[PDB]
Design an enzyme around this catalytic site. Sequence first.
Site, mmCIF file in Angstrom:
data_model
loop_
_atom_site.group_PDB
_atom_site.id
_atom_site.type_symbol
_atom_site.label_atom_id
_atom_site.label_comp_id
_atom_site.label_asym_id
_atom_site.label_seq_id
_atom_site.Cartn_x
_atom_site.Cartn_y
_atom_site.Cartn_z
ATOM 1 C CG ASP A 58 -33.180 -51.898 15.437
ATOM 2 O OD1 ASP A 58 -32.948 -52.495 14.371
ATOM 3 O OD2 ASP A 58 -32.359 -51.249 16.120
ATOM 4 C CG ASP A 83 -31.144 -53.451 10.774
ATOM 5 O OD1 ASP A 83 -31.788 -53.129 11.768
ATOM 6 O OD2 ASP A 83 -30.105 -52.847 10.518
#
Length: 320
Positions: free
Chosen positions: A35, A215
């Site tokens: 992430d 993201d």
Amino acid sequence: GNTTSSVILTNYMDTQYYGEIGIGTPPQTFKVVFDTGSSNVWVPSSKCSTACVYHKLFDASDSSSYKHNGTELTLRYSTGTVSGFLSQDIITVGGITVTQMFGEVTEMPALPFMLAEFDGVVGMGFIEQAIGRVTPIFDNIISQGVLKEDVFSFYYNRDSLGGQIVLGGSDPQHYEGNFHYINLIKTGVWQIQMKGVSVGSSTLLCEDGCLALVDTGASYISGSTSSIEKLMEALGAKKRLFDYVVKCNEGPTLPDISFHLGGKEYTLTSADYVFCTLAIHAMDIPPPTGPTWALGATFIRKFYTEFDRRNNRIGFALAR
Ligand SMILES: *[C@@H]1O[C@H](CO)[C@@H](O)[C@H](O)[C@H]1NC(C)=O
């Protein structure tokens, strides 16, 4: 030795893409999310009381390279919250073994985490987003000087692999055409500058500039409530009722959605965000990081992305 490691990911229904990492000597294999939105790595410890029941627990008395720390840390999310203490040991990711400080999770909330096919997280973020300023793993694997280029790429597949992260390069069998790079608006975050949203060949949102955080950890493409309900409006709509739902007869029928990112127009057709549920959601994100848009999974699916640390830019190519 100028390296390139490859990690193949599992696609848990277009919402969770995850991988395997090994921690310690010898390795405890954990399933993790990579992430770009976070900066700390964490996994549940065998010191865990809840959803510890359901995931692999890291057990330091089976590791010859553990050097305890013990300092607290609480890592907070738009979905979760987790806390524990800092540990230190050897991570092995696609064949790079790096010495990392990581949080041993001792308290996990029982709802979001229970139904999470993953055990923990490896954040691909900047030292600036690190709780405790624990040197994120990528700064650390770059410090080792083994990689070909200080870049890492991601392939999110459509639900035969599921997905794939390549550290040190990019995988040509999974992108086509050429990369066009957009520069980070400010380091510390993997955020670029967006110049509008054509919700047609006509609507225009953010015809000003708006921020877009690339993201990997995110499952949908998000925007602020405000922004997202104008966009849902001029499209099909059907507010709430388990999140923005449209007519199925007129799915094929919906228009294109285009992001103006540094020159080019990145457009996704109906088939990329209509599942009937729509792959777009709202998520007012707070300063410091918000107010921002978030190009998460839904975007990546369509565009193979390269995150470049040596030049602090993001490149995208058509995924294939
Ligand atoms: C552990 O790690 C932190 C890094 O934030 C350091 O400041 C702290 O002193 C360490 N604790 C010990 C006892 O090693």
